[PDB]
Amino acid sequence: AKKNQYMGTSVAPEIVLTDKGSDMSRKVKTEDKKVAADQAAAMGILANMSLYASLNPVKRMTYKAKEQAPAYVKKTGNPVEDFYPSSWRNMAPVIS
Amino acid sequence: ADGNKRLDAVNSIVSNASCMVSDAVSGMICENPGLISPGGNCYTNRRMAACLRDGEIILRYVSYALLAGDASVLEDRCLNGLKETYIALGVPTNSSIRAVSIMKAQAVAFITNTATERKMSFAAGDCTSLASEVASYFDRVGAAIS
Amino acid sequence: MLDAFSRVVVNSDAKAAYVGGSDLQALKSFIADGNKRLDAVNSIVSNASCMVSDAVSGMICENPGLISPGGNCYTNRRMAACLRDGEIILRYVSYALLAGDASVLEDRCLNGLKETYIALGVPTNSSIRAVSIMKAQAVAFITNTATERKMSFAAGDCTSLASEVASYFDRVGAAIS
Amino acid sequence: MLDAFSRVVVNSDAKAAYVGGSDLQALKSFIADGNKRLDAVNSIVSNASCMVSDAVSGMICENPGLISPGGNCYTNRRMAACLRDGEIILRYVSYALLAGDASVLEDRCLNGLKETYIALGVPTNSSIRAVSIMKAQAVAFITNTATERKMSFAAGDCTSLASEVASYFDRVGAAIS
Amino acid sequence: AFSSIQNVLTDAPLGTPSAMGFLDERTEKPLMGPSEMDELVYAVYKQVFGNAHIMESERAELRDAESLFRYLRDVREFVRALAKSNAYTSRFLQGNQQYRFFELNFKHLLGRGPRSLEEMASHSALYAEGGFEAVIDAILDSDEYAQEFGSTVVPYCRFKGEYPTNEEFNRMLVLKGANSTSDKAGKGRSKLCYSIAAGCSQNWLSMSKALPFGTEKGTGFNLISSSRNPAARPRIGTKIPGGVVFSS
Amino acid sequence: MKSVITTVVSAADAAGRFPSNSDLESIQGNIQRSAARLEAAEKLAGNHEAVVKEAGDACFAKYAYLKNPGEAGENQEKINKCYRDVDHYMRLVNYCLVVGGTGPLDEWGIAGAREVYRTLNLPTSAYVASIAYTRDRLCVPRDMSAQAGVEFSAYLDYLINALS
Amino acid sequence: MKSVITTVVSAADAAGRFPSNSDLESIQGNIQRSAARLEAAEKLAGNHEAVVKEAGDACFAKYAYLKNPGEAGENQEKINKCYRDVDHYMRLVNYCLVVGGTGPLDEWGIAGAREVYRTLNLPTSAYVASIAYTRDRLCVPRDMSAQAGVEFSAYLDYLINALS
Amino acid sequence: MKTPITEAIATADNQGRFLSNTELQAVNGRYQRATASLTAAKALTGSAQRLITGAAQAVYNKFPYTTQMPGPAYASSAIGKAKCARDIGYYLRMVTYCLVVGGTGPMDEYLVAGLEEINRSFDLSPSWYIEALQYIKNSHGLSGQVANEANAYIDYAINTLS
Numbered sequence A: 001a002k003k004n005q006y007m008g009t010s011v012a013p014e015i016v017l018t019d020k021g022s023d024m025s026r027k028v029k030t031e032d033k034k035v036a037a038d039q040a041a042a043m044g045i046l047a048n049m050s051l052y053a054s055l056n057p058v059k060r061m062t063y064k065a066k067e068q069a070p071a072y073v074k075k076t077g078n079p080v081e082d083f084y085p086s087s088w089r090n091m092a093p094v095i096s
Numbered sequence B: 001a002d003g004n005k006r007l008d009a010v011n012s013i014v015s016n017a018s019c020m021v022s023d024a025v026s027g028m029i030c031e032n033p034g035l036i037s038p039g040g041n042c043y044t045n046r047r048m049a050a051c052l053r054d055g056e057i058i059l060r061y062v063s064y065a066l067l068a069g070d071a072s073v074l075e076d077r078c079l080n081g082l083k084e085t086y087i088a089l090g091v092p093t094n095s096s097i098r099a100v101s102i103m104k105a106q107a108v109a110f111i112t113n114t115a116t117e118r119k120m121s122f123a124a125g126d127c128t129s130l131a132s133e134v135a136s137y138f139d140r141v142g143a144a145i146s
Numbered sequence C, D: 001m002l003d004a005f006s007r008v009v010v011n012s013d014a015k016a017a018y019v020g021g022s023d024l025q026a027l028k029s030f031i032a033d034g035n036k037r038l039d040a041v042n043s044i045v046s047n048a049s050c051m052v053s054d055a056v057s058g059m060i061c062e063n064p065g066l067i068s069p070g071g072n073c074y075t076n077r078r079m080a081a082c083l084r085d086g087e088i089i090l091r092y093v094s095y096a097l098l099a100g101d102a103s104v105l106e107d108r109c110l111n112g113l114k115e116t117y118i119a120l121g122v123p124t125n126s127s128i129r130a131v132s133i134m135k136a137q138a139v140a141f142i143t144n145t146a147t148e149r150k151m152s153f154a155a156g157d158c159t160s161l162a163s164e165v166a167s168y169f170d171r172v173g174a175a176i177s
Numbered sequence E: 001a002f003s004s005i006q007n008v009l010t011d012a013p014l015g016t017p018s019a020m021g022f023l024d025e026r027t028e029k030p031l032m033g034p035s036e037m038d039e040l041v042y043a044v045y046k047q048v049f050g051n052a053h054i055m056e057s058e059r060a061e062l063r064d065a066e067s068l069f070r071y072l073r074d075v076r077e078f079v080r081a082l083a084k085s086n087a088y089t090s091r092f093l094q095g096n097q098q099y100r101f102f103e104l105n106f107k108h109l110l111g112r113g114p115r116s117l118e119e120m121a122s123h124s125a126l127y128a129e130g131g132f133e134a135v136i137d138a139i140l141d142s143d144e145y146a147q148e149f150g151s152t153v154v155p156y157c158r159f160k161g162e163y164p165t166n167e168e169f170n171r172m173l174v175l176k177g178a179n180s181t182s183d184k185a186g187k188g189r190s191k192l193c194y195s196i197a198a199g200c201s202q203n204w205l206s207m208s209k210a211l212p213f214g215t216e217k218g219t220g221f222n223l224i225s226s227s228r229n230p231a232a233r234p235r236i237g238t239k240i241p242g243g244v245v246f247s248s
Numbered sequence F, G: 001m002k003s004v005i006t007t008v009v010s011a012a013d014a015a016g017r018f019p020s021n022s023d024l025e026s027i028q029g030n031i032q033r034s035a036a037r038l039e040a041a042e043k044l045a046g047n048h049e050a051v052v053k054e055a056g057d058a059c060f061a062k063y064a065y066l067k068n069p070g071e072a073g074e075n076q077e078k079i080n081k082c083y084r085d086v087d088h089y090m091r092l093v094n095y096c097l098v099v100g101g102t103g104p105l106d107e108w109g110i111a112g113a114r115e116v117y118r119t120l121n122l123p124t125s126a127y128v129a130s131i132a133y134t135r136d137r138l139c140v141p142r143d144m145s146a147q148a149g150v151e152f153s154a155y156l157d158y159l160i161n162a163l164s
Numbered sequence H: 001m002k003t004p005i006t007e008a009i010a011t012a013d014n015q016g017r018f019l020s021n022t023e024l025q026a027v028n029g030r031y032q033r034a035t036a037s038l039t040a041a042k043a044l045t046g047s048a049q050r051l052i053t054g055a056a057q058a059v060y061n062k063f064p065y066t067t068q069m070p071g072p073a074y075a076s077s078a079i080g081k082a083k084c085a086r087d088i089g090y091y092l093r094m095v096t097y098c099l100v101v102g103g104t105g106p107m108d109e110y111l112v113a114g115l116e117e118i119n120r121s122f123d124l125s126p127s128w129y130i131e132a133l134q135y136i137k138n139s140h141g142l143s144g145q146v147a148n149e150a151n152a153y154i155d156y157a158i159n160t161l162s
C-alpha cells in the first residue's frame, strides 16, 4: 500500500532533442528506459582514483585507511613460494 | 510560455550528462578516499557501477523535471522512499549528498554557459530563472535523502 | 594535568626509576623542534575564527536538515551555541598541541561530553563531520598547504607535527562517538 | 502446530503448487519486522508475574463475590489455582505472539477449555474480565505506554504487533465465552 | 518555607556574631578572640574546599587570605580570596570538565544545585567572555548570595523547604554527599552532566545517602523502577453516584 | 544446562535423529547475539564488587527492620552472608550471560531456593529488592551498549520473576 | 596588563608562594625575544603616519558606500575621526609589541569596543579591512628582519580575530 | 442492541440477502446525525454530578414525604438517599449510552426490560423518576439539535415510565 512501484527497477526517462535550425526539424521525444550498469567503465575511475589517493600525502593522514586481511593460502615451508608466489612474482610498476 | 530558452537549458545538460556523472562521483571519491578503500562500499567492482547508475538516474529525473517545469514526477518516482533504502543497504548519505551538490554546481555552470572547460553557442539573454529552478530541483533530491 | 616532560616522569615513577640518559633521547629531540611547534601553534591560532566559521558552514553544507525546523541547529540561539563549541574543541586541541600531550583533552574538555550531547540531543555524526573539517584545515595550515593564506616560515618538514595534531583531533572524534 | 511460515505451506498445499513470487511478500515483511517481534515478546516475558497478579487482583477488586465465602476464588487452593490458570493463558498467548500464528493457542489451551470451566463451576465471565485486563496490560507493555515501568527500545512503529496480540486475546476470551 | 529538617535534624549554621559592630566607631566587630576564629577558619576550609585533605605545605599559601580575615571580619571577602587561589583552581578546575567546575561552585559558595540548563548557559557565557574570576564574582556578589548567607555566615547547604523547583532539591543532595565524601571521586565527569541537559532526575539511593540522620531515608521504594514515564497517558477516574467519570 | 546447543541436541536425541538444518540455523543466532551478551558479561565481571555493594544497601534501606533483634539481619555475620548471597546471584547472572541461557540460574540459584528461604526465615522480598534496584540503575550508553543492557535486564527480570 | 611577568607573579600570588625557577624561566624567554620584538618598535614608531593613511584610504575604497548620506563617513571631520580611530589601534599594537603581551590592546581598544561600534553604527568590517590591509602590506626582508614581521603580524591578526 | 446499524443488518439477514442501498442509506443517516449526538454525550458527561444532585433535590422538593416517611423504600435515612442518587445516575448513564450509540438500544436492554417488576416489588413509584427526568430535561442547558437529541432520549424514558 505504500511501496514505490519503480524504486527497484532503475527505469528513468530518456530525452532526445533534434534541432537543425529549421522549424520542421525540431522534435523532442521522451521514453522510459532502464539504466544499465557498466562493468568496464567503473574500473578506470576506480583505478585512477586509487592511484590519486595513493599519491596524495595529506589524505594519507587525515584518512587513515583500514587494513584488509589477506585471503587464506597454505604455506609450504619453502620461502620462494611463500613470499613470492607465481600470482605475483616479478611484477613491478612502470612510471611514465 | 517560452520553450526556446527551456529546450536549450535541457539540451545543455542531456548532451554532456555522462561527463557530469563521472566527474561527480570522481570528485566524491576525491574528497574522501574511504569508499574505494577495502571495506568501503564503492570498493568492489559491482558497487561503483551501481553508484554510477544511481547518479545517472538522479540526473535523468532532474533533467526530465526541468523539462516538465514541475517536480511532482520527481517525488513520485525517484524520491519516494529512497533514504531508508540507502539506510537498509547501508550507504553513506553525506557523500551522495556531496555528489548531488557537485552535479548541481555543474548543471548551473552549463545552463549559464559559464562552464570554464567547454563552450556552447547560444542566443543572447538570461537563463538565471531556469538556473534557480534547477537549483531548487537539486535541493529537492538533496533534502529527500539525508 | 601533564605535558611531554611530565609524561616520562610519571612513567618512570611507576618503576621508581631515575630519569637517566637513555630516556632523554625523546625529550631532547622534543626540544630540537621546539621552534617548529611554536611556529605551528600561532599559525593555527592565527586563523582560529575563520576555521570555525568554515567548519560549521561545511557541516551545514551537506546536512541541510540541521537548518530545518526541529533541527538541532534551527534557531540562531542553537547556532550560537554550536558555533561556540567549535572554539572550545579547537582551543583544547591547540592546548594539547602546545603541551605535546593530550592529558588536557579528555580530562578537561572530552570528559563526559558524549553524555552531555546525548542528554541535549546533539547529533553525533554532524559534529564528527565538523571536527573532521577542522582537522583537515589544521593540517592544511601546519603544512602551509592552504590554497590562500601564505604564511612565511622556515624551510623544513613539519609533517610530524601534522600527524600529532591529526592524532589529537582523532581522540576528540572518538570521544563523542 | 503451525507458525506464520507453515501457514502458507498448508495454504498452498491445498493448491498443489510451488510457492514463490506472490506469496513471498508477507514472509519477507515478516522477516524484516522480526526484531520488533522479538523485542515485543521480550517485553511481555519480562513483566509476567506483575501482569498475572495485577490481573487477578483487578478481577477480584471489581467483583468481590469471588472471595466471598462460597465464591470460586474463596480458599487458598482456589486462589492459587486461579493464578495458575491465570498466566497458563499468558504463556500460550506469548507462544502465539512469538510464532506469529495462533494455532498453538488453539491446540493446547483452548481445545475444550469451554466446558472444563463449566464442569468445574468456574464463572466463565470473570475470566473474561481477567483476560481483558491482561490484554490491556500487554498492549501498553508492547507500545511502551506502561505507566509503572518504562523500557528501552529503538524508536519506531509497532502497532501491528499490538493489534495482533489484541487479536489473540479476544480469541482466548471468546473461546470460553 | 518551614525547613522541616533545617534546625532540628541539623545543627545551626556557624559564623560571625552579628553585623551591628560593622558600623564601626571604635572597632569593626567584638574581638571573637583567637580561639573562636580558628574554628571559624577551620569551618570555612571544610566548606569552600569541601574536605579536600589540604596539607600544611598547601596551607602555607593561604596565610595572606587568613591574616586579613581575622583583622577584618567579612566572611564573603574571605571566600572570594580563597576561591581565586591556586589551591582552589588546582583542585576543581585543573583536571575537570567545565560544567563540573560550574556545578562545584554551586555546592561550595551557594550551597544549592543548579536549577536549569539556562543557568549553566549563563555561567558558560560569563566564563567565555574573559575569565573564570568573573564566574566567582557573579556568584559571590549575587543577589541570591545576599539573601541566603550574607557577610556573616559560612555558606552552607540550607534545607529551604520552599524550593523554586524540585530538581534544585535533588541536585543539592547529589552534589553534597555524606561526611567523608570528597570532590575527587570521579575524575571530572560531573554527576549532573546528563541530568541537567536532559531534564530527568537523579538516583534515589545517592540522594538518600546524603540525607541527615533520622529522616526515614530510602524507604517507600516500589520494587519496579523509579524514573516516571512521560509517554504514559493513564486514565484516572472519579466517583459519581451514577458512575465513574474520566476527565481528559 | 539450558542453552541454545543443549536444547536442540536434546530434542534431536529424544527424536533419535541427526542434526538437521534447523539445529544449525539455531546456532547462527547464538553467533549473532554473542557479540552483545559477552561484552555484557565482561562489564559485569570487571565491576562486580561495586554493584554488589551498591545493591546490598538498597535492601536494608528499603527494609530497615531486618537489623532488629529476632530478625535475620541482626549481627555482622548475617549482613556478610547477605552480601555473599547477593554476590552469588550476580555471579550466576554473569554465568547465564556467558552460556546464553538460564541454565546456571535455574540449577544453582533457583531450584530449591524456596524451601531454604522459607525454612531459614529469609524474606524473599528483600532478596528481590536488590535485583530490582540493580535493574533500574542501568543506562545502556553509560554502563554498557544498547543490546547488552537488554540482555542484562532480561536475566534480571528472569531472576525476579523466579523469586516472586 | 597581560604580560609575561604579570602572568607568573600573579600565579605565584594566587598560590601564595615565592617565585621559583619555573617562573624565572619565562623572563628568560623574554630576554631572548625582546630584541626581535622591539626591532619593529622603531618601524612602527617612525613610519606610522604613512601606514595609517595607506590603511584608511584602503578602508574607504573597499567600502565606498560609507560616504553616502546617513552612513558613518557622511561629512569631512568624521573621515578625520576614522583616521584617528585607526591611529589609535596602531598606537596600541606598538604598545603591545613593547610590553610583550596583549595587555594594552585588550583593555584599551578591545574591551568594550562592541558597545561603541554598534550603538554608533560603525561597521566592524571596515576596521578589519583596514587592519588586514596592513597585515599583508608588509614585506619581511625590506621592512624588518624575519622575526619582527612574524610577531608584528601575530599582534595584528590578534585584534583582527578579536573584532571580526 | 437496537442501533441503526444492527437493525439494517437484521433486515438484510431476514431476507438472507446482501446489503442493498436501503441499508447503506439507513447507516448514512446515523453518520450525519452522529455529530450532534456526540456533542450531547460530551455535554451530559460534563454536567453529570451537578445534574444528579439537582434532580435528587427536585424530587425531594416535589415529594417531601419521601424524606419523612419511615421505611426501606423511602429516602428518609442516609442509605436511601445514596440509593436514590445511584438510581438517578443510572438513568443519566443510560441516556448518555443511547446518545452515543444512536438509538434506544442500551436503555431497552438495561433499564426498561423488567422495570415495573422492581417498582412493584420494591414499591418505588415511577412518578419520582419522571420528576427527576423532567428536571434533567429542563436543566441540561443545551441548544439546537443537541437539545433536540438529548430531550428525545429523555422523554422516551418518561413515556416508558408512564
Ligand SMILES: *C(=C)C1=C(C)[C@@H](Cc2[nH]c(/C=C3N=C(/C=C4\NC(=O)[C@H](C)[C@H]4CC)C(C)=C\3CCC(=O)O)c(CCC(=O)O)c2C)NC1=O
Binding pocket: B101, C047, C049, C050, C051, C054, C055, C057, C058, C059, C060, C061, C062, C132, C133, C136, C137, C138, C140, C141, C145, C146, C147, C148, C149
Ligand atoms: C558547503 C558545501 C561548503 C562550505 C561552507 C565550504 C566550507 C569548507 N571549506 C573547506 C576547505 C577549506 N577551508 C579553508 C579555510 C580557510 N581559508 C582561508 O583562507 C581562511 C584562513 C580559512 C577560513 C576562511 C581552507 C584553506 C580550505 C582548503 C582545504 C584546506 O584544508 O586547506 C571544506 C573541506 C574541508 C576539508 O576537507 O578541508 C569545507 C566543507 N566548503 C564547502 O564545500
Ligand SMILES: C=CC1=C(C)[C@@H](Cc2[nH]c(/C=C3N=C(/C=C4\NC(=O)[C@H](C)[C@H]4CC)C(C)=C\3CCC(=O)O)c(CCC(=O)O)c2C)NC1=O
Binding pocket: A017, A018, A019, A026, A027, A028, B002, B003, B004, B005, B007, B008, B009, B011, B111, B112, B113, B122, B123, B124, B125, B126, B127, B130
Ligand atoms: C527543439 C529544440 C529547441 C532548442 C534546443 C531551442 C534552441 C533555440 N533557442 C532559441 C532562442 C534562445 N535561446 C536562449 C537561451 C539561452 N541563451 C543564453 O544566452 C543562455 C546561455 C541560454 C539560456 C539557458 C535565449 C535567451 C533565446 C532567445 C529568446 C528565445 O527565443 O527564447 C531559438 C530561436 C533562435 C535561435 O536559433 O537562437 C532556438 C531554435 N529551441 C528549440 O525549439
Ligand SMILES: C=CC1=C(C)[C@@H](Cc2[nH]c(/C=C3N=C(/C=C4\NC(=O)[C@H](C)[C@H]4CC)C(C)=C\3CCC(=O)O)c(CCC(=O)O)c2C)NC1=O
Binding pocket: A006, A007, A008, A009, A010, A011, B025, B035, B041, B042, B046, B047, B048, B050, B051, B052, B054, B055, B057, B058, B077, B078, B082, B085, B089, B091, B092, B093, B095, B096, B099
Ligand atoms: C528508481 C530509482 C532508483 C535509484 C535512485 C537507485 C537506488 C538504488 N541503489 C541501489 C544499490 C546501490 N546503490 C549504490 C550507490 C551508492 N552507494 C554509495 O556508496 C554512493 C554514495 C552511491 C553511488 C554514488 C551502491 C554501491 C549499491 C549497491 C549496494 C550493495 O553493495 O548491495 C538499490 C538496490 C537495488 C540495486 O542494486 O539496484 C536501489 C533501489 N535504483 C533505482 O532503481
Ligand SMILES: C=CC1=C(C)[C@@H](Cc2[nH]c(/C=C3N=C(/C=C4\NC(=O)[C@H](C)[C@H]4CC)C(C)=C\3CCC(=O)O)c(CCC(=O)O)c2C)NC1=O
Binding pocket: A052, B016, B019, B020, B023, B026, B027, B028, B029, B030, B031, B102, B103, B105, B106, B109, B110, B114, B115, B116, B117, B118
Ligand atoms: C581528485 C579530485 C577531483 C575533484 C574534487 C573534482 C573537481 C571538480 N570540478 C568541478 C567543476 C566542473 N566539472 C564540470 C564537468 C565537466 N566539464 C566538462 O567540460 C565536461 C563536459 C564535464 C566532465 C569532464 C564543469 C563544467 C565544471 C565547472 C567548470 C567551469 O566553471 O567551466 C566540480 C564541481 C564544482 C566545483 O567544486 O568546482 C568538482 C567537485 N574532480 C576530481 O577529479
Ligand SMILES: C=CC1=C(C)[C@@H](Cc2[nH]c(/C=C3N=C(/C=C4\NC(=O)[C@H](C)[C@H]4CC)C(C)=C\3CCC(=O)O)c(CCC(=O)O)c2C)NC1=O
Binding pocket: C056, C072, C073, C077, C078, C079, C081, C082, C083, C085, C086, C088, C089, C108, C109, C113, C116, C120, C122, C123, C126, C127, C130, E097, E098, E099, E117, E118, E119, E120, E121, E122, E124, E197
Ligand atoms: C568544555 C567543553 C564544553 C563544550 C564542548 C560545550 C558542550 C555544550 N554544548 C551545550 C549546548 C549546545 N551545544 C550545541 C552544539 C551543537 N549542536 C549541534 O547540532 C552541533 C553538532 C553542535 C554545534 C556544532 C547546541 C545547538 C546547544 C544548545 C541547543 C539548545 O538547547 O537550544 C551545553 C549546555 C550548556 C548550557 O547551555 O547550559 C554544553 C555543556 N560546553 C562546554 O563547556
Ligand SMILES: C=CC1=C(C)[C@@H](Cc2[nH]c(/C=C3N=C(/C=C4\NC(=O)[C@H](C)[C@H]4CC)C(C)=C\3CCC(=O)O)c(CCC(=O)O)c2C)NC1=O
Binding pocket: C032, C033, C034, C035, C036, C038, C039, C040, C042, C142, C143, C144, C153, C154, C155, C156, C157, C158, G033, G147, G150
Ligand atoms: C615566541 C614565538 C616563537 C615562534 C613562532 C617560533 C618562530 C621560529 N621558528 C623557527 C624555525 C623553524 N620553523 C620551521 C617551520 C616551518 N618551516 C617551513 O618551511 C614549514 C612550512 C614550517 C613547518 C611548520 C622550521 C622548519 C624551522 C627551522 C628548524 C628549527 O628551527 O627547528 C625559529 C628558529 C629559526 C628562525 O628564526 O626561523 C623561530 C624563532 N619560535 C618562537 O620562539
Ligand SMILES: C=CC1=C(C)[C@@H](Cc2[nH]c(/C=C3N=C(/C=C4\NC(=O)[C@H](C)[C@H]4CC)C(C)=C\3CCC(=O)O)c(CCC(=O)O)c2C)NC1=O
Binding pocket: D032, D033, D034, D035, D036, D038, D039, D040, D042, D142, D143, D144, D153, D154, D155, D156, D157, D158, D159, D161, F033, F146, F147, F150
Ligand atoms: C536477536 C534477538 C533480539 C532482541 C533481544 C530484540 C532486541 C532488538 N530490538 C531491535 C529493534 C526495534 N525494536 C522495535 C520495537 C519497538 N520499539 C518501539 O519504540 C516500540 C515500543 C516497540 C514496538 C511496539 C523497533 C521499532 C526497532 C527498530 C528496528 C525495526 O524497526 O525493526 C533490534 C534491532 C536493532 C538494534 O540492534 O537495536 C534488536 C536486536 N530484537 C531481536 O531481534
Ligand SMILES: C=CC1=C(C)[C@@H](Cc2[nH]c(/C=C3N=C(/C=C4\NC(=O)[C@H](C)[C@H]4CC)C(C)=C\3CCC(=O)O)c(CCC(=O)O)c2C)NC1=O
Binding pocket: D056, D066, D072, D073, D077, D078, D079, D081, D082, D083, D085, D086, D088, D089, D108, D109, D113, D116, D120, D122, D123, D126, D127, D130
Ligand atoms: C493447558 C491449559 C490449562 C488451563 C487453562 C487450566 C484450566 C484448568 N483450570 C482448572 C481449575 C481452576 N481454574 C480456576 C480459575 C479461575 N476461577 C475463577 O473463579 C477465576 C475466574 C479463574 C482464575 C482467574 C480455579 C479457581 C480452579 C480450581 C477449581 C477448584 O479447585 O474447584 C482445572 C482443573 C484441574 C485443577 O487445576 O485442579 C483445569 C484443567 N489448566 C490447564 O492445564
Ligand SMILES: C=CC1=C(C)[C@@H](Cc2[nH]c(/C=C3N=C(/C=C4\NC(=O)[C@H](C)[C@H]4CC)C(C)=C\3CCC(=O)O)c(CCC(=O)O)c2C)NC1=O
Binding pocket: D047, D050, D051, D054, D055, D057, D058, D059, D061, D062, D132, D133, D136, D137, D140, D141, D145, D146, D147, D148, D149, E224, E232, E234
Ligand atoms: C480495584 C482493583 C484494581 C487493580 C489491582 C488495578 C489493576 C489494573 N491495572 C490496570 C492497568 C495496567 N496494569 C499494568 C501492569 C503493571 N503496571 C506496572 O507498572 C507494573 C510493571 C505491572 C504490574 C503492577 C500496566 C502496564 C497497565 C496499563 C498502563 C500503565 O499503567 O502504565 C488496569 C486497567 C486495565 C484496563 O484498562 O481494563 C486495572 C484494572 N486497578 C484496579 O482498579
Ligand SMILES: C=CC1=C(C)[C@@H](Cc2[nH]c(/C=C3N=C(/C=C4\NC(=O)[C@H](C)[C@H]4CC)C(C)=C\3CCC(=O)O)c(CCC(=O)O)c2C)NC1=O
Binding pocket: E064, E065, E066, E067, E068, E069, E070, E071, E072
Ligand atoms: C598582604 C600583606 C599583609 C600583612 C603585612 C599582614 C598584616 C597583618 N598582621 C596581622 C596580625 C598581627 N601582625 C603581627 C605582627 C607584628 N607585631 C609586632 O609587634 C611586630 C612589629 C610584627 C611582627 C614582626 C602580630 C603580632 C599580629 C597578631 C597579634 C594578636 O592579635 O594576637 C593582621 C590581622 C589579620 C588577622 O589575624 O585577622 C594583618 C592583616 N597581613 C597581610 O595580609
Ligand SMILES: C=CC1=C(C)[C@@H](Cc2[nH]c(/C=C3N=C(/C=C4\NC(=O)[C@H](C)[C@H]4CC)C(C)=C\3CCC(=O)O)c(CCC(=O)O)c2C)NC1=O
Binding pocket: F059, F066, F071, F072, F073, F077, F078, F079, F081, F082, F083, F085, F086, F088, F089, F108, F109, F116, F120, F122, F123, F126, F127
Ligand atoms: C551458588 C548459589 C548460592 C546462593 C544464591 C546462596 C543462597 C543462600 N543464601 C543463604 C543465606 C542467607 N541469605 C541471607 C540474606 C538476607 N537475609 C536478610 O536478613 C536479608 C533479607 C538478606 C540480606 C541480603 C542471610 C542472612 C543468610 C544466612 C541465613 C542464616 O544463616 O541464618 C544460604 C544459607 C547458607 C549460608 O549462606 O550460610 C544459601 C544456600 N548460597 C549459594 O551457595
Ligand SMILES: C=CC1=C(C)[C@@H](Cc2[nH]c(/C=C3N=C(/C=C4\NC(=O)[C@H](C)[C@H]4CC)C(C)=C\3CCC(=O)O)c(CCC(=O)O)c2C)NC1=O
Binding pocket: G056, G059, G066, G072, G073, G078, G079, G081, G082, G083, G085, G086, G088, G089, G108, G109, G116, G120, G122, G123, G124, G126, G127
Ligand atoms: C583607545 C582606543 C580608542 C578607539 C579605537 C576609539 C574608538 C572610537 N571611534 C569613534 C568615532 C568614529 N570612528 C569612526 C571610524 C570609522 N568609521 C567607520 O565607518 C569605519 C569603521 C572607521 C573608518 C576608519 C567614525 C567615522 C567616527 C565618528 C562617528 C561618531 O563619532 O559618531 C568614537 C566615538 C567618539 C569620537 O571619538 O568622536 C570612539 C570611542 N576611541 C578610543 O579611545
Ligand SMILES: C=CC1=C(C)[C@@H](Cc2[nH]c(/C=C3N=C(/C=C4\NC(=O)[C@H](C)[C@H]4CC)C(C)=C\3CCC(=O)O)c(CCC(=O)O)c2C)NC1=O
Binding pocket: G043, G044, G047, G050, G051, G054, G134, G136, G137, G138, G139, G140, G141, G142, G143
Ligand atoms: C611597518 C609596516 C610597513 C608595511 C606593511 C609596509 C607597507 C608599505 N608599502 C609601501 C610601498 C611599497 N611596498 C613594496 C613591497 C612589496 N610590494 C609587492 O608587490 C610585494 C608583495 C612587496 C615585497 C616586500 C613596493 C614595491 C612599494 C612601492 C609601491 C607600493 O606602494 O606598493 C609603503 C610606502 C612607503 C614604503 O615604501 O615603505 C608602506 C607604508 N611598509 C611599512 O613600513
Ligand SMILES: CCC1=C(C)/C(=C/C2=NC(=C\c3[nH]c(/C=C4\NC(=O)[C@H](C)[C@H]4CC)c(C)c3CCC(=O)O)/C(CCC(=O)O)=C2C)NC1=O
Binding pocket: H056, H059, H066, H072, H073, H074, H075, H076, H079, H080, H081, H083, H084, H085, H087, H088, H090, H110, H111, H118, H122, H124, H128
Ligand atoms: C439498571 C438500572 C437500575 C435501576 C433503575 C435500579 C433500581 C432499583 N432501585 C432499588 C431500590 C431503591 N431505590 C430507591 C430510590 C428512591 N426512593 C426514594 O424514596 C427516592 C424518592 C428515590 C430516589 C430518587 C431507594 C430508597 C431504594 C431502596 C428500597 C429498598 O431497599 O427497599 C432496587 C432494589 C435493589 C437495591 O436495594 O438496590 C433496584 C433494582 N437498579 C438498577 O440497577
